[PDB]
């Protein structure tokens, strides 16, 4: 009865659904079978998979379909993670059913889970992986037959938290999972001018749906007062050791007899640790013991670990003697609070104070699905939110305040980057000559891009005031041989090592598409222009530095047309990690500045066509990353300041 | 067989659909009458409307419906600028169906469709009383019914061109249409959360419709080119008449003759003039007239409004003797040209290739109007468009240029406000006191506000360098004073005089609503905070004024929230006319620089709370507003800075 609607529908069409055993996948999978499509439903787990399959079968039929064992097939124990799983899961869909029609990208998983700071770089790139590199593997796979038969539809389930055209949504403790929303989004961005006319691509992308957060809540809870906890220890020794004598190892040493009340009252103790050791006392529930204690083993050892990634010398068994605090570390009290506090923050976003379902959702995508005359765009099937959003792509900016570069002179600047050699030596020039730094770190790719820039530098080298250190692959370590041998950095600037590639974008309509992208060309793609970025960003807040610019790719007048859409997939992509970044580091007390500084822009018109305006576009590129590096002075970091000079994006 | 997806659909709904004897409207209220609802068509032509409703009653007797005459009702004769006739039809509609539950505000007009500086402002009034201010109307008197029954849905029927959440797009010619659709947009986008839960607002925004550009297309290709020599003509005359000691009257006798060569070939004309005639001699069809005669009537009586418009002092019968020259003035091969130029550029937009039909538009639509879980969206039922976009919302800049800076010194500064005393007297006192103005002309809208203003600058009116004029409604006879007494301005600042006001934007479920904020109050709402600006803009540029900057209303950490959400309404809306004047002032060479500061921001947390950040936000503001009206020196106004310079806004 309430099915009549989508009765043929999508008669005719064949239908891949990865994650189709739960969730709004296997929703969405259901109704396009009632609509008349025929689907393949992958997923990891065979249990799951074969229950949905035999739900939609016996629905078909009640219905009135016949033979229903041929309208539903699935693909268990297919982790999309995997190139080979997903090379598998085409071979079998095409055995089952020839072209597919509507590829359906849904598969996701929730990722890391963890603050940038807190996130080990294979988590971050199996999060890529899974919830984005996946969805290119099989559009990779499965255009050039759409193409060949003359129609598809690509549709990429991304969220609202992968953010809009032109506004990133921060998604704090979620970064990974955020740019791979958002990459989901950017792709159908910029491919639907390579794959008109014959293939429509779109992103969904719902808010909270009913079962999206799958005692549970309460661990959760938890965690979140624990990593509170650790944030705030984290931010006060950071910030104690950068003004005290005392090196990190004995500034760990003034919490080890884990006593809150003791390090309030040493009058040796940094200001900075007695306040806190204050605020704990007055802030926290007399019946727990986080308000006694300063922490417990598993805070200890994962403060320890940022410690150590930001390249802090410490024992590794300094925290083996800590006295345990008696158990409730936080009281049920404090725990149900929190998590009352996370329920009634999700449904107090809602304008329509209801929470959707995931049948709902998956209604409103396969009505979406009918229609033949959208591509490049994001439908929101439910919506009206209260959330944070971050615009950008503002142009029209000037310098800094003189105060603001007047915190430049003496500094320690990091310049990371090895293609864009031009930009590296202006800049270098700049903080050297200008505004008075003491010493700019040079850190590239290669021994080539190093005797690159120590020759364009030669003056600067000679005289003691530009380092070259060589990454390769590895440029958390090089960063600690930088940390060091030079002190720990200021400013910072990170360029990608590599440039866009010149390959096409889509084949011709009768062609095997062999020079086209390939999956491993598009994941390398993400290595060095998204993970490049999320790794320095990790690195230098972990180490202290007190601003950082990310750099996306420079588009000019004569960028191939593929650049162009390659350069805007990874500068809207980019820009969800900026934004949530930057208020990760807001809302737990870093001092440190995060910033993008754009090179891309959106269209070829819009690029410097002459020596006078590339001269005019160069100084506003100077500009632009001195008015984001440039610390702010004492009397300037308030919180509103706070949130204006972090999260932000500026096209040069 | 088509329809049977619809049938059902929307079975027990009542729907109100103006501008519904054609277009997407009429086919939206046939999809809606075929999927179940009753529909109240509205329309200016009685006889068109009689057509869709015989059309749309024999399809609902084909598919199997009943006594088709109680399920389509007509209101023609309903012009929806009017509202006596809103009211009208309210009542008809409440009399046949009872209460509405799916209001389709479709009705709206092309518009004025000129250029600002050729607008007329009550032809700009006129576009939004029937596409902006009609929508407000009918959910004023629609929305009690509906919130009493516990449901309702108010769908607004934008354009592309309405921009989009923070970017704005371009619409040249058509800046009046392009507010129209921006507000229908924001009034969703704000609204929302009043409305919710019992009500829907969104809107749908299609790109290109097969029909909507509705022998005519020949006509407008002409038009096109007469205006192309109206703008050359006028840029040329205005750019000589500011260096050349010649009066604007002495310099249009020079045309006089109407001879392209002559002019040309004149030693004592001024470069400007000789170069624009060489052009056109070049640039020019040599069987056309226009490539040997500077003008015809037409072009000349509207030439002649723009110099009396902008103050410039002329005789009426000026051109009185004009020759007239001999048809073609633009050939059938330049007039073909652009024409397939503007067809060709509109099929260029599309990813798909391929115009959509109102059909299916309309189909899209009526399946979107099922979901209830989306408000305050922006559907796009037809999309996948190439098209320029202009970002807003950028927070992060500096002060502009020393070089840019310096162009102030000995300026004529005007600004304009009335309630924003604190920022005025400061703007007055940077201006004067940091950068060297010469004088400031404050044009306020009362005694009273001149009388404050003149306390608060006492110093600088007792030396002569800050003179006070009173405008009331009459702020272009305002600035012709200024203009005769104190001479043409360089910067400008508009700002509003009023503040916003502070009624309810709903009302409680059991109300009458009569404190609810009125429609007349949303049309003074737009005159004060929409037509201000423009009227400003139309007047300024015509003036020839070097920089404008539009400012939007202050939002506080103590704002109401219904303060917040006229706020943000006025500030997504006037990004619409910011950046479409942008785009024409560049595109015809006129060298205004026209931009947009925001005194609004998005959510409340973001407002300072502290004397501190409240000196930190002023500083901000003066920081902003001389970033965008300090002029461009010579060395620097390229055609890529230009574009920056142009169109933006940025958030203090
Ligand atoms: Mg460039
Ligand atoms: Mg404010």
């Not at 899974?130 to 969220?159: D, E, F, T």
């Not at 008075?436 to 600067?460: C, K, N, P, S, Y």
């Not at 805007?568 to 990690?577: D, E, G, P, Q, S």
Request: net charge negative; hydrophobic share 40%; proline share 5%.
């Amino acid at each position: 009865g309430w099915a009549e609607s989508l009765i043929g529908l999508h008669l005719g069409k064949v239908a891949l659904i990865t994650g189709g055993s739960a969730g709004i996948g296997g929703q969405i999978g259901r109704l396009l079978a009632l609509s008349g499509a025929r689907v393949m439903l992958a997923a990891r787990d065979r249990h799951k998979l074969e229950q949905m399959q035999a739900m939609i079968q016996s629905e078909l039929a009640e219905v009135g379909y016949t033979d229903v064992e041929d309208r539903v097939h699935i693909a268990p124990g297919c982790d999309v993670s995997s190139e080979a799983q997903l090379a598998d899961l085409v071979e079998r869909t095409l055995s089952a059913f020839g072209t597919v029609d509507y590829l359906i990208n849904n598969a996701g998983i929730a990722g890391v889970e963890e603050m940038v700071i807190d996130m080990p770089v294979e988590g971050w790139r199996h999060t890529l992986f899974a919830n984005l590199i996946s969805n290119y593997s099989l559009m990779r796979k499965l255009a050039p037959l759409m193409k060949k038969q003359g129609s598809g539809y690509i549709l990429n389930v991304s969220s609202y938290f992968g953010g809009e055209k032109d506004a990133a949504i921060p998604y704090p403790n979620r970064a990974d999972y955020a740019v791979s929303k958002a990459g989901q989004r950017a792709m159908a961005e910029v491919f639907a001018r390579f794959l008109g006319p014959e293939i429509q691509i779109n992103a969904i992308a719902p808010g909270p749906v009913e079962g999206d957060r799958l005692g549970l809540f309460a661990r959760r809870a938890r965690l979140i007062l624990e990593n509170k906890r650790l944030n705030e220890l984290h931010a006060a020794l950071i910030a104690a050791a950068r003004t005290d004598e005392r090196s990190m190892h004995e500034l760990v040493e003034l919490l080890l007899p884990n006593d809150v009340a003791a390090l309030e009252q040493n009058p040796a103790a940094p200001t900075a640790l007695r306040e806190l050791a204050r605020r704990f006392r007055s802030e926290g529930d007399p019946a727990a013991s986080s308000s006694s204690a300063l922490l417990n083993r598993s805070i200890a050892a994962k403060l320890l670990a940022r410690l150590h990634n930001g390249g802090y010398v410490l024992p590794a068994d300094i925290f083996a003697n800590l006295p345990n605090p008696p158990d409730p570390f936080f009281t049920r009290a404090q725990i149900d609070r929190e998590a009352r506090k996370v329920r009634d923050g999700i449904m107090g976003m809602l304008y329509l104070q209801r929470m959707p379902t995931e049948f709902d959702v998956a209604m409103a995508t396969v009505y979406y699905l009918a229609d033949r005359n959208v591509s490049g765009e994001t439908f929101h099937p439910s919506g009206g939110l209260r959330y944070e959003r971050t615009p950008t792509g503002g142009e029209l900016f000037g310098l800094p305040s003189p105060e603001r570069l007047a915190e430049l002179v003496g500094s320690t600047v990091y310049l990371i980057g090895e293609h864009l050699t031009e930009h590296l030596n202006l800049l270098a020039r700049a903080y050297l000559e200008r505004y008075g730094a003491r010493q700019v770190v040079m850190i590239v790719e290669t021994e080539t891009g190093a005797e690159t820039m120590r020759r364009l530098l030669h003056d600067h080298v000679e005289a003691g005031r530009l380092m070259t250190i060589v990454a390769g692959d590895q440029i958390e370590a090089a960063i600690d041989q930088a940390i060091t041998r030079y002190g720990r950095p200021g400013p910072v600037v990170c360029t990608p090592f590599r440039p866009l590639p010149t390959v096409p974008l889509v084949g011709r309509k009768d062609s095997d598409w062999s020079t086209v992208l390939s999956e491993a060309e598009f994941a390398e793609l993400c290595e060095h222009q998204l993970t490049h970025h999320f790794r320095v960003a990790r690195k230098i807040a972990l180490s202290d530095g007190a601003s950082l610019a990310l750099v996306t790719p420079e588009t000019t007048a004569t960028s191939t047309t593929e650049q162009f859409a390659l350069a805007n997939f990874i500068k809207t992509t980019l820009h969800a990690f900026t934004a949530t970044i930057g208020v990760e580091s807001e809302r737990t007390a870093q001092r440190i500045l995060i910033n993008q500084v754009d090179l891309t822009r959106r269209a070829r018109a819009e690029e410097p066509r002459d020596p006078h305006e590339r001269q005019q576009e160069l100084e506003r590129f100077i500009e632009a990353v001195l008015l984001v590096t440039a610390p702010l002075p004492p009397e300037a970091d308030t919180r509103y300041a706070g949130r204006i000079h972090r999260g932000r994006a500026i096209t040069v």
